[PDB]
Design a protein around this ligand. Structure first.
Ligand SMILES: [K+]
Ligand SMILES: [K+]
Ligand SMILES: [K+]
Ligand SMILES: [K+]
Ligand SMILES: [Mg+2]
Ligand SMILES: [Mg+2]
Ligand SMILES: [Mg+2]
Ligand SMILES: [Mg+2]
Ligand SMILES: [Mg+2]
Ligand SMILES: [Mg+2]
Ligand SMILES: [Mg+2]
Ligand SMILES: [Mg+2]
Ligand SMILES: [Mg+2]
Ligand SMILES: [Mg+2]
Ligand SMILES: [Mg+2]
Ligand SMILES: [Mg+2]
Ligand SMILES: [Mg+2]
Ligand SMILES: [Mg+2]
Ligand SMILES: [Mg+2]
Ligand SMILES: [Mg+2]
Ligand SMILES: [Mg+2]
Ligand SMILES: [Mg+2]
Ligand SMILES: [Mg+2]
Ligand SMILES: [Mg+2]
Ligand SMILES: [Mg+2]
Ligand SMILES: [Mg+2]
Ligand SMILES: [Mg+2]
Ligand SMILES: [Mg+2]
Ligand SMILES: [Mg+2]
Ligand SMILES: [Mg+2]
Ligand SMILES: [Mg+2]
Ligand SMILES: [Mg+2]
Ligand SMILES: [Mg+2]
Ligand SMILES: [Mg+2]
Ligand SMILES: [Mg+2]
Ligand SMILES: [Mg+2]
Ligand SMILES: [Mg+2]
Ligand SMILES: [Mg+2]
Ligand SMILES: [Mg+2]
Ligand SMILES: [Mg+2]
Ligand SMILES: [Mg+2]
Ligand SMILES: [Mg+2]
Ligand SMILES: [Mg+2]
Ligand SMILES: [Mg+2]
Ligand SMILES: [Mg+2]
Ligand SMILES: [Mg+2]
Ligand SMILES: [Mg+2]
Ligand SMILES: [Mg+2]
Ligand SMILES: [Mg+2]
Ligand SMILES: [Mg+2]
Ligand SMILES: [Zn+2]
Lengths: 206, 60, 24, 80
RNA sequence: UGAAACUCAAAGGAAUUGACGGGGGCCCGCACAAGCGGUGGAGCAUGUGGUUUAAUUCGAAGCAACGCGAAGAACCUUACCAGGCCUUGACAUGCUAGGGAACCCGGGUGAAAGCCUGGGGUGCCCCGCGAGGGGAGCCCUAGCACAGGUGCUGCAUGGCCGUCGUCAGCUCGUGCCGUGAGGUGUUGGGUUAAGUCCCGCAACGAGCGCAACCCCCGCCGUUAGUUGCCAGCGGUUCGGCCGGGCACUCUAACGGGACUGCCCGCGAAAGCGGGAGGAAGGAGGGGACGACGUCUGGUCAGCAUGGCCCUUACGGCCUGGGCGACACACGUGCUACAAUGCCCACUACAAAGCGAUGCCACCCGGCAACGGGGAGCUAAUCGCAAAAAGGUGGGCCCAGUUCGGAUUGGGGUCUGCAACCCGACCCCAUGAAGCCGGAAUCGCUAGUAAUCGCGGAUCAGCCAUGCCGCGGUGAAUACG
């Protein structure tokens, strides 16, 4: 086991945080436990929308927030009937009373978190892994990207012996601290057990 | 984390002593950093996700 | 030496104060 | 180099059970789970069975032992 | 000359890619050597094996397990053990029912938990003149759907880590070679820390790695002054104290700066050897970063997860034990054995950090731990704060000794409901072994080793001598 998470490794440059709220040694642990409660629900439901990211800003009880999805509509609802229930679900969770914007993911095939989610689902439906991977790398590589890679864990195809399927194209320089590489990890329950899915997309350097 | 010993939230220890940090995310009771309420493991997991604001990778 | 409880350097090592090492 | 401070400690379980038991006089046996408590004057003559984690050892309290905790007469471990 | 019974699924040839050799040639790394200081010896601290135990919870096992998970075991934690008590439960989402609001406060009993058991109380919705009737929520039962399980599988797995390692290396696309595995590229000369670069080549290029892009330290410059100065001057309680000023030092953002560029020498080139400027050369010094893969490696006890198993107990609650046992063995450390030393005075010079239910200036009491009381600080303003080693002076004269502080007796202060098992800390006694450590064996190439002290996480307190960091002083040696 080697190699640091390419995001935690690139926070300095090519990659901003997912919560830009300041705090002091007395509340930080709370505002933190909160964000998690937030992402906890957001993901527990908005799964179908396909949520790549979820930023959370703050200034004082005016918890900005956002949610970058591939299919906004799923969030909104008929006119805005869903984005309503949820918007109240936030302040019912935390009597903070906060916003809840929505950014659209231009291409859901250049967001590693989705590409991962993608393959991860196929795996559960029993699609041939190698195919999915081969394909996935394509979807990513076709719609732009100077490089990409996908990794599935083991028990591939219900096998007893856990393996590790590969597949990757173009460049994916992890050692280069500037690559700007989106990384996405998707679990994948199954009748026989878990399978991990990692996704890497290299888009633009400098 | 034996979801039953996660009675730390009890707040009714009879004696404030028995009160013990314990992780908020894993239930991990042995490396809970006051400041984050997390255990050393998750503290490392989230920091990688950039979900812990300000928290970067130190180096010198 | 550093192990002599009731001595100068002894108190320092053990990070304490007392007759053999008062707080000025 | 013993210590406790100003306020000798003794659990009130047996206390109000002894000083009270002194009303009629003495009695046979007692049963405590307070190794914690200090042995005080008003116990001399009593026979307090102390728990050691598995047993309730019968400890006859005397003048010379007034001051020691009860646990000190109910040895925990068993060696050879 | 030359069988048979019985028996095997192979026996063989050539070539390929590897691994291997007590085969060869080049070449690296504190690998050896050269050094300097240590450890297996003592006492003690801590982890472990082994014994023991009602239990001494579990895992880790050559390197890469053994101050490891545990960055804090008195209860808690703890998963262990003994007892007392729960058993749709400590926590989820639901159910028909038998039926009584939620809630507030009690008293028996008990180690606590729990169990009886008795009471203030009884709102809300559509009905009803009312009486009172049927429901939402809620709680309490009684019976379900289930919860829960640090119970077994790390050889069923994610994830994450360690390891061979920052060691270079591992590959691909097309072309070319070969019936084929597969070769060529990546081999070869030169060079590099490097598959680094150069030159040459049936190969031309490319990907993951190397390097670079990020952080810290070293020199200079902008921008900025409740930290700095009296450098400059004038007030002085002669204290940067006050005026006043950003120069300086800092603080912290942004830039500059080094490219083998310049010079001489060698070379086909890359580059090597010097020389000059320069704070800094030829990766300035230290980090972050560890390819294709291997160990079928670690971890289901951090979490997640398939299967398996227990589901009045392999779940749950307490009180008390235990994880701290002790004939014995090992690892990692601490303090020492002393004069290049130990004391007591008195005096200097740090850097990074931490500080509300807190750092705690200062004052008083106490030999002291600490207790009273209180100034200032949400901290470049105040506090922890003394840095220690050093330096000046004085004592000890070489002795188990003014070395060394282990044991043990006594008296106390604190934290905590509570220190018997099983806490640090202070004071008086006591004053052990040890006079430098067998065979073995460990670290380190320079601000490194050695040595000196300071702060942090965890945390009430603490068994920190661990760990992660900080700065002071500052070597030896490397033929090869
Ligand atoms: K042969
Ligand atoms: K550098
Ligand atoms: K394995
Ligand atoms: K020393
Ligand atoms: Mg669990
Ligand atoms: Mg605690
Ligand atoms: Mg905490
Ligand atoms: Mg001495
Ligand atoms: Mg035959
Ligand atoms: Mg052949
Ligand atoms: Mg061969
Ligand atoms: Mg060979
Ligand atoms: Mg070397
Ligand atoms: Mg070296
Ligand atoms: Mg040597
Ligand atoms: Mg020894
Ligand atoms: Mg024994
Ligand atoms: Mg186990
Ligand atoms: Mg063990
Ligand atoms: Mg260690
Ligand atoms: Mg316990
Ligand atoms: Mg394994
Ligand atoms: Mg694994
Ligand atoms: Mg194992
Ligand atoms: Mg290298
Ligand atoms: Mg080819
Ligand atoms: Mg051919
Ligand atoms: Mg080849
Ligand atoms: Mg080939
Ligand atoms: Mg090769
Ligand atoms: Mg090849
Ligand atoms: Mg070759
Ligand atoms: Mg070479
Ligand atoms: Mg290269
Ligand atoms: Mg070539
Ligand atoms: Mg300057
Ligand atoms: Mg690198
Ligand atoms: Mg092993
Ligand atoms: Mg194994
Ligand atoms: Mg232990
Ligand atoms: Mg040792
Ligand atoms: Mg005084
Ligand atoms: Mg002797
Ligand atoms: Mg002596
Ligand atoms: Mg204790
Ligand atoms: Mg001597
Ligand atoms: Mg420290
Ligand atoms: Mg502490
Ligand atoms: Mg101890
Ligand atoms: Mg300590
Ligand atoms: Zn966690």
């Amino acid at each position: 086991g080697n190699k640091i998470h390419p995001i935690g490794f690139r926070l300095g440059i090519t990659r901003d945080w997912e919560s830009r709220w300041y705090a002091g040694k007395k509340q930080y642990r709370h505002l933190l436990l909160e964000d998690q409660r937030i992402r906890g629900l957001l993901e527990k439901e908005l799964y179908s929308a396909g949520l790549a990211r979820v930023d959370i800003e703050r200034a004082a009880d005016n918890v900005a927030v956002t949610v970058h999805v591939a299919k906004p509509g799923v969030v909104i609802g008929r006119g805005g009937e869903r984005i309503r229930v949820l918007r109240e679900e936030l302040a019912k969770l935390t009597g903070k009373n906060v916003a809840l914007n929505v950014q659209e993911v231009q291409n859901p095939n250049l967001s590693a978190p989705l590409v991962a989610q993608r393959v991860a689902e196929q795996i559960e439906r029993r699609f041939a892994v190698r195919r999915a991977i081969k394909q996935a790398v394509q979807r990513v590589m076709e719609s732009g990207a100077k490089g990409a890679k996908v990794i599935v864990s083991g028990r591939i195809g219900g096998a007893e012996q856990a393996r590790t399927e590969w597949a990757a194209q173009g460049r994916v320089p992890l050692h280069t601290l500037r690559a700007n590489i989106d990384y996405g990890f998707a679990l994948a329950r199954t009748t026989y057990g878990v399978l991990g899915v990692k996704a890497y997309i290299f888009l633009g350097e400098v | 984390a034996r979801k039953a010993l996660i009675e730390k939230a009890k707040r009714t220890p009879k004696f404030k002593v028995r009160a013990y940090t314990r992780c908020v995310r894993c239930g991990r009771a042995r490396s809970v950093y006051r400041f984050f309420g997390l255990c050393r493991i998750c503290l490392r997991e989230l920091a990688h996700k950039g979900q812990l604001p300000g928290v970067r990778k130190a180096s010198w | 030496g550093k192990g002599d409880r009731r001595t100068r350097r002894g108190k320092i090592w053990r990070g304490t104060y007392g007759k053999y090492r008062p707080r000025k | 180099p013993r210590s406790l401070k100003k306020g000798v400690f003794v659990d009130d379980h047996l206390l109000e059970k002894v000083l009270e038991l002194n009303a009629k006089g003495e009695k046979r046996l007692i049963k405590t789970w307070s190794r914690r408590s200090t042995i005080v004057p008003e116990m001399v003559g009593h026979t307090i069975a102390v728990y050691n984690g598995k047993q309730h050892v019968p400890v006859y309290i005397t003048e010379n032992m007034v001051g020691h905790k009860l646990g000190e007469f109910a040895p925990t471990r068993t060696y050879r």
